[PDB]
Amino acid sequence: VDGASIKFDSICLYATFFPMAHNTASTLEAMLRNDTNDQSFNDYLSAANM
Amino acid sequence: NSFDGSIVSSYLTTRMPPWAGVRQNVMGSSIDGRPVLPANSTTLTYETVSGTPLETAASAAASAAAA
Amino acid sequence: LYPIPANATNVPISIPSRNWAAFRGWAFTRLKTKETPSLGSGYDPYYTYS
Amino acid sequence: DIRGVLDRGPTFKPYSGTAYNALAPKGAPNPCEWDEAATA
């Protein structure tokens, strides 16, 4: 009602890579592609809001 | 200045660093023609984003609120 | 020789890296500029002092 | 990374109190002139 308005101009994604040595990077990739070394997660709240 | 007759450049000079605003201090200009103050000006210490155009006057929003 | 401008008070110098085998010490003195002729060239028309 | 223009409208006001003549008494009127019909 008070006419406070917003206007997005542009958006660019940024990311940062650890300059891992290529041999170690490849070894780490081969490790994490294993079936058993999968990555798990859980939401901190863990809940089902109603 | 009583006609200092010394060699105009006796000290060692250092290669000009290649980036913006260090070659010389002259009244510059924007991309679209706005004047730019010299490199060693005080007013260039901080940053002035100076995005001028706000969003269009939301009179349509006022009418929508009324309706 | 090193130039010392008028009313001055520090003169710094340097020699770039070299080997210093068999060095045997420094020795320095100060001369009036208009009293030192420009040796090394055939004839200096700016040596107006006798 | 997001950049753009944001307008807060007339109602944005981060300072409590006023900005002009803050010391002045709140009832004191500025030097003014006005009309006043009267017959004597």
Side-chain angles (χ1 to χ4, degrees):
Chain A
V1 189
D2 286 337
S5 179
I6 191 187
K7 160 203 163 191
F8 285 172
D9 191 15
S10 73
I11 156 189
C12 314
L13 169 57
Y14 280 89
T16 303
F17 298 78
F18 177 92
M20 182 108 50
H22 287 167
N23 293 275
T24 52
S26 179
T27 297
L28 183 65
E29 171 184 352
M31 290 222 201
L32 299 191
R33 291 276 171 77
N34 186 313
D35 167 55
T36 180
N37 298 318
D38 300 337
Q39 316 179 22
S40 75
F41 287 95
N42 65 327
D43 182 274
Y44 176 79
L45 178 57
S46 17
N49 311 278
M50 316 253 47
Chain B
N1 186 269
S2 63
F3 264 168
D4 293 354
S6 57
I7 328 179
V8 198
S9 173
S10 57
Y11 313 104
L12 176 51
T13 64
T14 317
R15 40 176 300 168
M16 181 192 65
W19 66 79
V22 81
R23 34 191 295 272
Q24 67 166 0
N25 319 12
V26 175
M27 195 83 158
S29 71
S30 73
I31 169 65
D32 63 340
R34 225 72 45 77
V36 178
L37 286 87
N40 66 262
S41 168
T42 299
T43 186
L44 222 61
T45 286
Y46 48 85
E47 171 186 8
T48 86
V49 286
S50 312
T52 119
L54 47 136
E55 187 40 60
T56 306
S59 68
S63 304
Chain C
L1 291 157
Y2 293 88
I4 304 195
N7 285 81
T9 189
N10 187 310
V11 175
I13 69 175
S14 172
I15 301 300
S17 179
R18 284 199 93 270
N19 183 291
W20 300 77
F23 194 84
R24 44 187 306 271
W26 302 263
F28 47 83
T29 305
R30 184 175 177 183
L31 349 164
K32 203 182 280 77
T33 290
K34 74 177 187 179
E35 293 191 322
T36 299
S38 312
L39 285 68
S41 185
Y43 150 78
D44 174 12
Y46 297 113
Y47 184 56
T48 95
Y49 153 83
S50 65
Chain D
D1 180 277
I2 294 178
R3 41 177 168 176
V5 175
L6 139 74
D7 176 37
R8 293 152 152 173
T11 74
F12 174 67
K13 178 193 176 185
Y15 58 88
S16 300
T18 181
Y20 315 135
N21 298 19
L23 303 173
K26 299 176 181 173
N30 312 265
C32 54
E33 300 180 6
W34 68 92
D35 315 76
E36 183 181 7
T39 300

